Design a protein around this ligand. Structure first.
Ligand SMILES: [Cu+2]
Ligand SMILES: [Cu+2]
Ligand SMILES: [Cu+2]
Ligand SMILES: [Cu+2]
Ligand SMILES: [Cu+2]
Ligand SMILES: [Cu+2]
Ligand SMILES: [Cu+2]
Ligand SMILES: [Cu+2]
Ligand SMILES: [Cu+2]
Ligand SMILES: [Cu+2]
Ligand SMILES: [Cu+2]
Ligand SMILES: [Cu+2]
Lengths: 282, 282, 282
């Protein structure tokens, strides 16, 4: 039987930094000197509270703003609400999450669970256009009790024309073995719409990307249109019914894929081999 | 317990006008001299019939065309089907709605319920491009029996680059008190795609925007891509789990928000105060 | 009672050709000299295996690549995986499908059923941009056991600015009689986003486009945003609740419809008449 998320409700503390990278980009990290683009994954259970002690190490104002989760206005990360951070300064942002449940009026309160993201809101413009462009974004996962847990989670961000702020024809590639349970967090940012496509695999267009049983009528898809600040996620069994292989993923807007914004889901046999893929050639 | 829609099935009569506004725009109204952009909300119960006596007060042909509802071809509001209205003229359009139910072949007929809209179809071009651009659009809500009813309904239209045909940096803003049940009808028009985003609140991506219970697998979101003539709607509890505040909503396409196509969901305490928002400054 | 799909699980064999058409386009067909744009419909039941003996009759490399269905890497139809076909050559592609079911870990494997499509992947560029532009695309339907079957299926492809590679103002038009069960496969290709809209009819935004009963919360819509390589499908009862008529369908992006990328769903009475439509005028 698969591993499932437990009941949430813990108070968690975390340290985060925004830093200026040597190449001109901007990144978040849990440790000074280890910023990354995309920023590190934040994963919690519904009911958890997260206190993020955030330090802006840059020479310009920056902030941390989150989609989906609960936060008071003092943590929305905007200049308007006095919620951003001065150069060199520190601020504690508080994000909360809640379980679903019956309200007193008989209606159903939705829970926080889902695939979300955080990003800057004050670098370059008052909507963080420069910070987002430079790499100040990252994924957030909120698990409902009983959600299936993966072997591994990969984050794919279509940021303007780039994937994860990388140059054309440099992936990123991800690797799995046939049978691995692989999770994908898909995020889009910037100016353009895109269509995310994966070869050889498919998922359900609902909250978790998977179907619990025969009664769920959601569309099963391998192609999905997205726009700036859209986020969704899903799980696949690597190679299920299709075998090992170098399975492309890409934006399917034809000029975008033609520019080289493509990557590989390298699904291996146990011996590491991939049919039709020769390592000493890529 | 919350208020819910009753069983429908009434014949309703209504008067509507299309008018040329002093500033060059075009608007619908229920009373001559009270046209608005967006046009007034039309709200009915599944099963209702609506007879709209429509007068074109303009000096060009205009029409009324509706999404989603039942209408015979004599009420589709197009030039091709002889269904538009000459300058100064009057025409009675008939819109019908139906409840869902079992067909004789055992399949399930969907009902009319949902978030829809009406707009012009002959001003400027034979697809109403000029009429839509000038402001001839408005919302329609069809309620299913038992649908939860809100305290108030607001209409947000992304029309080309504008929100509700307003200049940049002029909202519109909407107001609520913490705990109000607020309904949003979201409509998009024109040439461009957008992504609607609200700070501090979220909803379900299904027919009503809310979940009835734990079995609904729909994605819970705060960001949604839309295109011309898309319509959706939802309800939120103002400030639920997040408190009072000036909560932004905006298109999240970065250049669109940078141009100032943003507004505020001003959620107040009972005393009218909003933390971090000073009235004598906006 | 309506006709429903039976249990699948047959091995099917098929012959397909890619050909260069006299007007400069490129098309797939089941018979040499009978290529079409869109290519012919491939329709199977979940569990079926399809062996397609594909001959490239053109003077450039071409391939066959499919969305959604199961295929080993030797049938993905790409140059990278040595899976395309040389001029004049032949290759057998194998597509498989599977039923949904319970995995050993207790989770639910989704089935192949849905609305999918096939297209070229090596003409013009290594993502088939030229082949797709020239007309190398077609629809695939995979039926689940018990899926409702239509009287007829029509394929509408928004390919760049064209519908089905046709010039503006040339449809295509489709015909039905009031009460026919009509299926639409909607596919989008190329560079642009679109919004598909039909007058006088609506469908459910889920896997099959129809609701099985009162518990399905999916949005009922008549307008839907799409991007390159998106596919969805649905069924309608022609004229249900609205009667005979020339019911437009079009992209609702205003400049796209203004250019003439529109068609007619001609719903007739038994005597062939259509109110407000005069044949000797179109
Ligand atoms: Cu914002
Ligand atoms: Cu793209
Ligand atoms: Cu593909
Ligand atoms: Cu955002
Ligand atoms: Cu129309
Ligand atoms: Cu926008
Ligand atoms: Cu936000
Ligand atoms: Cu319309
Ligand atoms: Cu591909
Ligand atoms: Cu279009
Ligand atoms: Cu319409
Ligand atoms: Cu494709």
């Amino acid at each position: 039987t698969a591993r499932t998320a437990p009941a949430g409700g813990e108070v968690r503390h975390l340290k985060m930094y925004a830093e200026k990278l040597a190449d001109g980009q901007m990144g978040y990290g849990f440790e000074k000197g280890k910023a990354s683009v995309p920023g590190p994954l934040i994963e919690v259970n519904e009911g958890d509270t997260l206190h993020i002690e955030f330090t802006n190490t840059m020479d310009v104002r920056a902030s941390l703003h989150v989609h989906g989760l609960d936060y008071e206005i003092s943590s929305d990360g905007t200049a308007m609400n006095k919620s951003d951070v001065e150069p060199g300064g520190t601020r504690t942002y508080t994000w909360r999450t809640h379980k679903p449940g019956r309200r007193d009026d008989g209606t159903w309160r939705p829970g926080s669970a889902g695939y979300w993201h955080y990003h800057d809101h004050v670098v370059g413009t008052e909507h963080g256009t420069g910070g987002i462009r430079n790499g100040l974004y990252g994924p957030v996962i909120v698990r409902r009790k009983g959600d299936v847990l993966p072997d591994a989670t990969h984050t794919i961000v279509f940021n303007d024309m780039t994937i994860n702020n990388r140059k054309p024809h440099t992936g990123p590639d991800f690797e799995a073995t046939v049978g691995d349970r692989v999770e994908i967090v898909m995020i889009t940012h910037g100016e353009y719409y895109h269509t995310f496509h994966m070869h050889g695999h498919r998922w359900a267009d609902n909250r978790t990307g998977i179907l619990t049983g025969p009664d769920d009528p959601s569309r099963v898809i391998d192609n999905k249109i997205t726009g700036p600040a859209d986020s969704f996620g899903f799980q696949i069994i690597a190679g299920e019914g299709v075998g090992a292989g170098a399975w492309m993923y890409h934006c399917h807007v034809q000029s975008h894929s033609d520019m080289g914004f493509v990557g590989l889901f390298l699904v291996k046999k146990p011996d590491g081999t991939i049919p039709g893929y020769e390592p000493h050639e890529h």
